[PDB]
Coordinates of C-alpha atoms and ligand atoms in Angstrom, one line a residue:
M1 CA -0.1 -0.1 -0.2
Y2 CA 1.0 3.4 -0.5
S3 CA -0.7 5.8 1.8
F4 CA -1.2 9.7 1.7
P5 CA -1.4 12.1 4.8
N6 CA -4.9 12.4 6.3
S7 CA -5.4 15.4 4.4
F8 CA -3.6 15.3 1.0
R9 CA -6.6 15.5 -1.5
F10 CA -7.1 13.8 -5.2
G11 CA -8.8 15.8 -7.9
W12 CA -8.5 17.0 -11.3
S13 CA -7.7 20.4 -12.8
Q14 CA -9.6 22.2 -16.0
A15 CA -9.7 25.4 -18.4
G16 CA -12.3 27.4 -19.1
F17 CA -11.7 27.9 -22.6
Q18 CA -11.3 24.0 -23.2
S19 CA -14.0 22.5 -21.3
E20 CA -16.6 25.5 -21.2
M21 CA -18.2 25.7 -24.6
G22 CA -20.5 23.2 -26.9
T23 CA -23.9 23.4 -24.4
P24 CA -25.7 26.4 -27.0
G25 CA -25.9 29.5 -24.6
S26 CA -22.2 28.9 -23.6
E27 CA -20.2 30.7 -26.9
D28 CA -17.5 33.1 -25.9
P29 CA -16.2 34.6 -29.1
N30 CA -14.6 37.9 -27.3
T31 CA -11.3 36.2 -27.2
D32 CA -7.6 36.1 -28.9
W33 CA -7.7 32.2 -29.0
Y34 CA -11.4 31.8 -30.4
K35 CA -10.7 34.6 -33.5
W36 CA -7.2 32.9 -33.4
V37 CA -8.5 29.2 -34.1
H38 CA -11.4 30.6 -36.6
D39 CA -8.8 32.3 -38.5
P40 CA -9.4 31.3 -42.4
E41 CA -5.3 31.5 -43.4
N42 CA -4.4 29.9 -39.7
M43 CA -6.6 27.0 -40.7
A44 CA -4.9 26.5 -44.2
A45 CA -1.5 27.0 -42.6
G46 CA -2.4 24.3 -40.5
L47 CA -1.4 25.7 -37.7
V48 CA -4.8 25.3 -36.0
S49 CA -6.8 22.1 -36.4
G50 CA -10.0 23.2 -37.3
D51 CA -11.9 22.1 -34.7
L52 CA -13.9 24.8 -32.8
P53 CA -14.3 25.3 -29.1
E54 CA -17.9 26.2 -29.5
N55 CA -18.0 22.3 -30.5
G56 CA -16.5 21.4 -27.1
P57 CA -17.9 19.2 -23.9
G58 CA -20.3 21.5 -22.4
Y59 CA -19.2 22.2 -18.5
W60 CA -20.9 25.5 -19.2
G61 CA -24.3 24.0 -19.3
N62 CA -23.3 20.2 -17.7
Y63 CA -21.6 21.5 -15.1
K64 CA -23.7 19.7 -12.6
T65 CA -23.0 15.9 -14.3
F66 CA -18.9 16.9 -14.4
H67 CA -19.1 17.1 -10.5
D68 CA -21.9 14.2 -9.9
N69 CA -18.7 11.8 -11.7
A70 CA -15.9 13.4 -9.6
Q71 CA -17.8 13.0 -6.4
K72 CA -18.6 9.1 -7.2
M73 CA -14.8 9.0 -8.4
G74 CA -14.1 10.5 -4.5
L75 CA -12.5 13.4 -5.9
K76 CA -12.0 16.2 -2.7
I77 CA -10.1 19.1 -5.2
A78 CA -10.9 21.1 -8.0
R79 CA -8.8 23.9 -9.7
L80 CA -10.5 26.1 -12.7
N81 CA -10.1 29.5 -13.9
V82 CA -12.6 32.0 -14.8
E83 CA -12.5 33.7 -18.3
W84 CA -11.5 37.7 -18.4
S85 CA -13.4 37.7 -21.9
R86 CA -16.5 36.4 -20.3
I87 CA -16.7 39.0 -17.4
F88 CA -15.3 42.3 -19.1
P89 CA -15.9 41.5 -22.7
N90 CA -16.0 45.2 -23.6
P91 CA -13.1 47.7 -24.0
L92 CA -12.5 49.8 -20.4
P93 CA -11.2 53.3 -20.5
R94 CA -7.9 53.5 -20.5
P95 CA -6.4 54.9 -17.1
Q96 CA -5.8 58.8 -16.1
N97 CA -1.7 59.3 -15.1
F98 CA -0.6 56.0 -16.2
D99 CA 2.6 56.1 -18.3
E100 CA 1.9 53.6 -21.0
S101 CA 5.6 53.4 -21.7
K102 CA 7.3 52.7 -18.6
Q103 CA 8.9 49.1 -18.5
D104 CA 8.0 49.0 -14.8
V105 CA 5.0 48.2 -13.1
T106 CA 5.5 48.2 -9.3
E107 CA 2.2 49.3 -8.1
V108 CA -1.4 48.9 -8.9
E109 CA -3.6 51.2 -6.4
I110 CA -6.8 49.0 -5.8
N111 CA -9.8 50.0 -3.4
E112 CA -13.4 49.7 -2.8
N113 CA -13.9 52.6 -5.2
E114 CA -12.0 51.2 -7.9
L115 CA -13.6 48.1 -7.5
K116 CA -17.3 49.7 -7.5
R117 CA -16.4 51.4 -10.6
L118 CA -15.3 48.2 -12.0
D119 CA -19.1 46.3 -11.4
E120 CA -20.5 49.0 -14.0
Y121 CA -18.3 47.0 -16.8
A122 CA -18.8 43.2 -15.6
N123 CA -20.8 41.0 -17.1
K124 CA -23.4 39.8 -14.2
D125 CA -25.1 36.8 -16.2
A126 CA -20.8 35.5 -16.4
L127 CA -20.6 36.4 -12.4
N128 CA -23.5 34.6 -11.2
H129 CA -23.4 31.8 -13.8
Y130 CA -19.9 31.1 -12.4
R131 CA -21.3 31.4 -9.0
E132 CA -23.6 28.8 -9.4
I133 CA -21.0 26.2 -11.6
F134 CA -18.8 27.2 -8.0
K135 CA -21.7 26.5 -5.4
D136 CA -22.7 23.2 -7.0
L137 CA -18.8 22.5 -6.8
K138 CA -18.4 23.3 -3.1
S139 CA -22.1 21.5 -2.3
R140 CA -19.8 18.1 -3.2
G141 CA -17.3 19.0 -0.6
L142 CA -14.4 19.8 -3.2
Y143 CA -11.8 22.2 -2.0
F144 CA -11.7 25.0 -4.7
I145 CA -8.5 26.2 -6.2
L146 CA -9.6 29.1 -8.5
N147 CA -7.1 30.3 -10.7
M148 CA -7.5 33.6 -13.1
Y149 CA -5.8 33.2 -15.9
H150 CA -5.3 30.1 -18.4
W151 CA -4.4 31.4 -21.8
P152 CA -7.1 33.2 -23.6
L153 CA -7.1 37.3 -23.4
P154 CA -10.2 39.9 -23.9
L155 CA -10.0 40.6 -27.6
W156 CA -10.0 44.3 -26.7
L157 CA -6.5 43.6 -25.0
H158 CA -5.2 41.2 -27.8
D159 CA -6.0 41.3 -31.5
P160 CA -3.5 38.1 -32.4
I161 CA -4.0 38.2 -36.2
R162 CA -2.8 42.0 -36.3
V163 CA 0.5 40.6 -34.3
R164 CA 1.0 37.8 -36.5
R165 CA 0.8 40.1 -39.7
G166 CA 3.5 42.4 -37.9
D167 CA 1.5 45.1 -37.1
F168 CA 2.1 46.4 -33.3
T169 CA -0.3 49.2 -33.3
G170 CA -3.4 47.2 -31.8
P171 CA -3.9 45.7 -28.5
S172 CA -0.6 43.3 -28.2
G173 CA -2.0 41.1 -25.5
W174 CA 1.4 40.6 -22.5
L175 CA 3.9 42.9 -24.5
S176 CA 1.6 45.9 -23.4
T177 CA 1.7 47.0 -19.4
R178 CA -1.8 47.9 -20.2
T179 CA -2.5 44.2 -20.0
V180 CA -0.5 44.1 -16.9
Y181 CA -2.3 46.8 -15.3
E182 CA -5.7 45.7 -16.0
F183 CA -4.9 41.9 -14.9
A184 CA -4.0 43.1 -11.4
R185 CA -7.7 44.6 -11.0
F186 CA -9.5 41.8 -12.9
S187 CA -7.3 39.7 -10.2
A188 CA -8.7 41.6 -7.5
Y189 CA -12.2 42.3 -8.7
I190 CA -12.5 38.3 -8.8
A191 CA -11.4 37.6 -5.3
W192 CA -13.7 40.3 -4.4
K193 CA -16.8 38.8 -6.3
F194 CA -15.6 35.0 -5.2
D195 CA -13.7 34.8 -1.7
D196 CA -16.7 33.3 0.2
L197 CA -16.4 30.2 -1.9
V198 CA -12.4 29.6 -2.8
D199 CA -9.9 28.0 -0.9
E200 CA -6.7 29.3 -2.5
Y201 CA -6.1 31.3 -5.7
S202 CA -3.8 30.9 -8.5
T203 CA -3.0 33.9 -10.6
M204 CA -2.3 32.3 -13.6
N205 CA -1.4 28.6 -15.3
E206 CA 1.7 28.0 -17.6
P207 CA 2.7 31.6 -18.6
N208 CA 5.6 30.2 -19.7
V209 CA 4.0 28.2 -22.7
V210 CA 2.0 31.1 -23.7
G211 CA 5.1 33.0 -24.5
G212 CA 7.4 30.6 -25.4
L213 CA 5.4 28.8 -27.7
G214 CA 3.4 32.4 -28.9
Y215 CA 7.0 33.9 -29.6
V216 CA 9.5 31.0 -30.4
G217 CA 7.7 27.6 -31.2
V218 CA 5.4 29.4 -34.0
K219 CA 5.0 25.5 -35.6
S220 CA 2.7 25.1 -32.3
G221 CA 0.1 27.3 -33.8
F222 CA -0.3 29.3 -30.6
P223 CA -1.3 33.2 -30.7
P224 CA 0.2 35.4 -32.0
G225 CA 2.5 33.4 -33.8
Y226 CA 5.1 36.2 -34.0
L227 CA 8.7 34.9 -33.9
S228 CA 10.8 37.2 -32.2
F229 CA 13.3 36.3 -29.0
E230 CA 12.8 40.1 -27.9
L231 CA 9.5 39.4 -27.9
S232 CA 9.5 36.5 -25.9
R233 CA 11.8 38.4 -23.4
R234 CA 9.1 41.3 -23.1
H235 CA 6.1 39.0 -22.7
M236 CA 8.0 36.9 -20.0
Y237 CA 9.1 40.4 -18.0
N238 CA 5.2 41.5 -17.7
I239 CA 4.3 38.4 -16.8
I240 CA 6.3 38.5 -13.8
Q241 CA 5.1 41.9 -12.8
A242 CA 1.4 40.6 -13.7
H243 CA 2.1 37.9 -11.5
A244 CA 3.3 39.9 -8.7
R245 CA 0.8 42.9 -9.3
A246 CA -2.1 40.0 -9.0
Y247 CA -0.7 38.5 -5.8
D248 CA -0.9 42.4 -4.2
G249 CA -4.3 43.0 -5.8
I250 CA -5.8 39.8 -4.0
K251 CA -4.3 40.1 -1.0
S252 CA -5.8 43.4 -0.6
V253 CA -9.1 41.8 -0.4
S254 CA -8.4 38.1 0.8
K255 CA -5.9 36.7 3.5
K256 CA -6.0 33.4 1.6
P257 CA -3.0 31.7 -0.1
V258 CA -2.1 33.0 -3.5
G259 CA 0.2 30.8 -5.8
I260 CA 1.1 30.3 -9.6
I261 CA 0.7 27.3 -11.7
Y262 CA 3.9 26.5 -14.3
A263 CA 4.8 24.2 -16.7
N264 CA 7.7 22.0 -15.8
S265 CA 9.7 19.7 -17.6
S266 CA 12.7 17.1 -15.8
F267 CA 15.9 18.3 -17.4
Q268 CA 17.8 14.9 -17.7
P269 CA 21.6 14.3 -19.0
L270 CA 22.0 12.4 -22.4
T271 CA 25.3 11.3 -21.0
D272 CA 27.2 11.6 -17.4
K273 CA 29.0 14.6 -18.8
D274 CA 26.0 16.6 -19.0
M275 CA 25.1 17.7 -15.6
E276 CA 26.1 21.3 -16.1
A277 CA 23.9 21.1 -19.1
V278 CA 21.0 20.0 -16.8
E279 CA 21.6 23.3 -14.1
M280 CA 21.7 25.5 -16.6
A281 CA 18.5 24.2 -18.4
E282 CA 17.0 24.3 -14.8
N283 CA 18.2 28.0 -14.7
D284 CA 16.8 29.2 -18.0
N285 CA 13.2 27.1 -17.7
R286 CA 12.2 27.3 -14.0
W287 CA 14.7 29.2 -11.2
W288 CA 15.4 32.4 -13.5
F289 CA 11.1 33.0 -13.1
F290 CA 10.9 31.7 -9.2
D291 CA 14.0 33.7 -8.3
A292 CA 12.1 36.9 -9.6
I293 CA 8.5 36.6 -7.5
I294 CA 10.1 34.4 -4.6
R295 CA 13.5 36.7 -3.9
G296 CA 12.8 39.4 -6.3
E297 CA 16.0 38.6 -8.3
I298 CA 16.0 39.8 -11.8
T299 CA 18.2 40.9 -14.8
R300 CA 17.1 43.7 -16.2
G301 CA 19.5 45.5 -18.7
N302 CA 22.6 43.3 -18.2
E303 CA 22.6 43.9 -14.4
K304 CA 21.1 41.3 -11.5
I305 CA 18.8 43.5 -9.0
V306 CA 16.5 43.0 -6.1
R307 CA 13.1 44.7 -7.0
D308 CA 11.4 45.1 -3.4
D309 CA 7.7 45.0 -5.3
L310 CA 8.6 41.4 -6.6
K311 CA 10.0 39.7 -3.6
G312 CA 7.9 37.3 -1.4
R313 CA 5.0 37.5 -4.1
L314 CA 4.2 33.7 -3.8
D315 CA 2.4 31.4 -1.1
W316 CA 2.6 28.1 -3.0
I317 CA 4.0 26.3 -6.5
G318 CA 1.4 24.5 -8.9
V319 CA 3.5 21.7 -10.4
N320 CA 2.4 21.1 -14.0
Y321 CA 4.5 18.0 -15.2
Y322 CA 3.9 15.4 -18.2
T323 CA 7.6 14.5 -19.5
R324 CA 11.4 14.8 -19.3
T325 CA 13.5 17.0 -21.6
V326 CA 17.0 15.0 -22.3
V327 CA 19.5 17.7 -23.1
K328 CA 23.4 17.7 -23.7
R329 CA 26.4 20.5 -22.9
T330 CA 27.7 22.1 -26.3
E331 CA 30.5 24.4 -26.9
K332 CA 28.1 27.7 -26.6
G333 CA 25.6 26.1 -23.9
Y334 CA 23.2 23.1 -24.2
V335 CA 20.4 21.4 -26.6
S336 CA 17.3 19.6 -26.1
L337 CA 17.0 16.2 -28.1
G338 CA 14.5 15.1 -30.3
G339 CA 13.7 11.2 -29.9
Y340 CA 12.9 12.0 -25.9
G341 CA 10.3 13.7 -23.8
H342 CA 7.9 16.1 -25.8
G343 CA 9.7 15.6 -29.1
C344 CA 8.8 11.8 -29.9
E345 CA 7.0 10.0 -32.9
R346 CA 3.0 9.4 -31.4
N347 CA 2.2 6.0 -30.4
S348 CA 5.7 5.1 -30.7
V349 CA 8.8 4.5 -28.6
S350 CA 11.2 7.0 -27.5
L351 CA 15.1 6.7 -28.3
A352 CA 15.2 4.8 -24.7
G353 CA 12.6 2.4 -25.6
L354 CA 9.9 3.9 -23.6
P355 CA 6.4 4.3 -24.8
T356 CA 4.9 7.4 -25.9
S357 CA 1.4 8.9 -25.8
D358 CA -1.1 9.9 -28.8
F359 CA 0.5 13.5 -28.5
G360 CA 4.2 11.8 -28.9
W361 CA 5.3 12.6 -25.1
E362 CA 7.7 10.1 -23.5
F363 CA 6.7 7.7 -20.2
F364 CA 8.9 9.3 -17.4
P365 CA 7.0 9.4 -13.9
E366 CA 10.5 9.6 -12.1
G367 CA 10.6 13.4 -13.5
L368 CA 7.8 14.4 -11.4
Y369 CA 9.6 13.4 -8.1
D370 CA 12.9 15.0 -9.6
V371 CA 10.9 18.5 -9.9
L372 CA 9.1 18.2 -7.0
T373 CA 12.1 17.5 -4.6
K374 CA 13.9 20.5 -6.2
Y375 CA 11.4 22.9 -6.2
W376 CA 11.1 21.8 -2.1
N377 CA 15.0 21.9 -1.6
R378 CA 15.5 25.7 -3.3
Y379 CA 12.2 27.4 -2.0
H380 CA 10.5 25.0 0.7
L381 CA 7.3 26.5 -0.4
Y382 CA 4.2 23.9 -0.2
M383 CA 3.0 22.5 -3.5
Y384 CA 0.1 20.8 -5.4
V385 CA 0.7 18.8 -8.5
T386 CA -1.7 21.1 -10.4
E387 CA -1.6 19.2 -13.8
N388 CA -0.2 15.6 -15.0
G389 CA -1.8 13.2 -17.4
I390 CA -1.6 12.0 -21.0
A391 CA -3.2 11.8 -24.2
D392 CA -4.8 8.2 -24.6
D393 CA -8.2 7.9 -26.0
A394 CA -8.1 3.9 -25.9
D395 CA -6.9 3.9 -22.3
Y396 CA -3.9 1.6 -22.7
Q397 CA -1.4 3.7 -21.1
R398 CA -3.5 6.0 -18.5
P399 CA -3.6 3.3 -16.0
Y400 CA -0.1 2.9 -15.6
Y401 CA 0.6 6.7 -16.2
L402 CA -1.7 7.5 -13.2
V403 CA -0.2 4.9 -10.6
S404 CA 3.3 5.6 -11.6
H405 CA 2.9 9.5 -11.3
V406 CA 1.0 9.3 -8.1
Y407 CA 3.7 6.8 -6.8
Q408 CA 6.4 9.3 -7.3
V409 CA 4.3 12.2 -5.4
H410 CA 4.1 9.6 -2.7
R411 CA 7.8 9.3 -2.9
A412 CA 8.4 13.1 -2.7
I413 CA 6.4 13.3 0.4
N414 CA 8.5 10.5 2.1
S415 CA 11.6 12.5 1.0
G416 CA 10.0 15.1 3.2
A417 CA 8.1 18.1 0.5
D418 CA 5.2 19.2 1.4
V419 CA 2.8 18.2 -1.5
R420 CA -0.9 18.7 -0.4
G421 CA -2.4 17.1 -3.4
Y422 CA -2.7 15.8 -6.7
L423 CA -4.7 17.2 -9.5
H424 CA -5.0 14.7 -12.8
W425 CA -5.2 16.7 -16.5
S426 CA -8.0 16.2 -16.6
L427 CA -11.8 14.8 -15.4
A428 CA -12.9 14.7 -19.2
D429 CA -11.5 15.4 -22.4
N430 CA -11.5 18.7 -23.7
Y431 CA -10.2 21.0 -26.5
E432 CA -6.2 20.5 -26.6
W433 CA -5.5 24.1 -28.1
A434 CA -4.4 24.2 -31.8
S435 CA -4.6 20.5 -32.0
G436 CA -8.3 20.1 -31.4
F437 CA -10.4 17.5 -29.8
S438 CA -8.4 14.4 -31.1
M439 CA -5.9 15.1 -28.0
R440 CA -7.9 13.3 -25.4
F441 CA -6.8 13.6 -21.6
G442 CA -9.8 12.4 -19.9
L443 CA -10.3 9.7 -17.0
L444 CA -13.6 10.5 -18.9
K445 CA -14.2 10.1 -22.5
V446 CA -16.7 12.6 -24.1
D447 CA -19.0 11.8 -27.0
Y448 CA -18.7 15.0 -28.6
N449 CA -22.2 14.4 -30.6
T450 CA -24.4 14.1 -27.5
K451 CA -21.9 15.4 -24.1
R452 CA -22.3 12.3 -22.6
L453 CA -19.2 11.2 -20.7
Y454 CA -17.8 7.6 -20.0
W455 CA -15.8 6.4 -17.6
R456 CA -12.4 4.8 -18.9
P457 CA -11.2 2.2 -16.8
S458 CA -8.5 4.7 -15.6
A459 CA -11.3 6.4 -13.7
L460 CA -12.0 3.0 -11.6
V461 CA -8.4 3.0 -10.8
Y462 CA -8.6 6.5 -9.9
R463 CA -11.7 6.2 -7.8
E464 CA -9.8 3.1 -5.9
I465 CA -6.9 5.9 -4.9
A466 CA -9.0 8.6 -4.2
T467 CA -11.6 6.5 -1.8
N468 CA -9.1 5.1 -0.1
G469 CA -6.3 7.7 0.2
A470 CA -3.8 5.3 -1.1
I471 CA -2.3 3.2 -4.1
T472 CA -4.0 0.0 -2.8
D473 CA -2.3 -3.3 -2.9
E474 CA -4.9 -4.4 -5.6
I475 CA -3.6 -1.7 -7.9
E476 CA 0.2 -1.6 -7.2
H477 CA 1.3 -3.3 -10.1
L478 CA 0.4 -0.6 -12.3
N479 CA 3.1 1.5 -10.9
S480 CA 5.3 0.4 -14.0
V481 CA 5.9 1.0 -17.3
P482 CA 2.9 0.5 -20.1
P483 CA 4.7 -3.0 -21.9
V484 CA 5.6 -2.0 -25.2
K485 CA 5.5 -5.0 -27.3
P486 CA 1.8 -5.1 -27.7
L487 CA 1.6 -1.3 -28.8
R488 CA 2.8 0.3 -31.8
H489 CA 6.9 1.0 -32.5
Ligands
OML1 C1 -1.3 21.6 -19.2 C2 -1.2 20.2 -20.7 F1 -0.2 19.7 -20.4 C3 -2.3 20.3 -21.6 C4 -2.0 19.2 -22.6 O1 -1.5 20.0 -23.8 C5 -3.0 21.4 -21.7 O2 -4.4 20.7 -22.1 C6 -3.3 22.4 -20.4 O3 -4.0 24.0 -20.9 C7 -1.9 22.5 -20.2 O4 -2.5 23.7 -18.8

């Protein structure tokens, strides 16, 4: 048996854009992502699948069913976001005496009156619908992590097609301090409306992937698909500040924990000569960011300084994990290797003989122990596993994936790391961004014609885990690698 603390909670994570739409009445056409996946030219290029999110699993209407299934599955924690676009679909008037050309955003003044002024702009039907969703959630004894942001921005803050075309005269998303300013205020507003329901907060989900795939990994078909190292850096600088300002915003209205959710890889050495490459990869993809919002340490210009408005802006770390990245040392630095981690053939085997998912991601659960213990030893902040799952419509690999990753969290806790829950990605299949609906991550299969949910056998396995608070003796064999001999090579 692998028994978790009596306080540890098993549950799931879910995004607004990915799961809400699909039931008539749910449509939200006021985001960069909506416009981006409907773009005629993006569709002809193959940057997006042609699948549309309004044909989705319909959480907006069917949330009672999602929650029924979660309660039956014995789940005790949920993490979801509100969609900004839903709450403030229309442009807000530019602020008076805020200099849109200043690089730094060290304060956003928020009070009772700035909040009541916002009320005048807020979509009240959206607020009331979210309140109905969250109450039903709480009525099942589900502990509630509310996230403010999981990638789509209001169109009035980002027109991604204008930016793709090389036009920076329009709303430019995270490239603009206006977006930072409004993000702090949005976060404050949501905490002010929802803090009676909420247990813990996250500002953002994986802001590193928004900027990485948006401005460098442009084959991903992520908005705005404008290839620039420079704009990639500006995005990440503005998101650090947006996080700090959102923290202050929330803390002005709530005494509750405020964290962030971030995309992690376990960096692994190709040979025993590549350990320094692993540390350099960890500095570039992880520490640089967390040292900013925890220690206030940052590089502006070519100089290492401490910003007092950034220091101490984090109570907990949301660890999002799916696979490793293999790196080697170069003369000039380090490189990632294809044929491992996220860079594999779909439904095959990696260069190490490990099975790959429907998305071409290598099976490597020990990476999750690496990431949790490295965060713990550097910062000693408590963590949730806010995301872990696999694209696997057939359910061949998911039972092994689920039990193996849960074992590695048990291993981290046993090592001394404070990890308070495990949230699977995801309860049900959903819209996988530029890939569309083909990549199915759910414990529950979604028939998109009917919106009906079905229990994949891995859902029955997760119910064993969640209702016992343990990997039981009877399912312990699934702590192993899916046998590759019967799978595609
Ligand atoms: C985490 C994740 F891995 C997937 C799969 O690509 C996305 O669907 C989530 O939005 C992301 O947070």
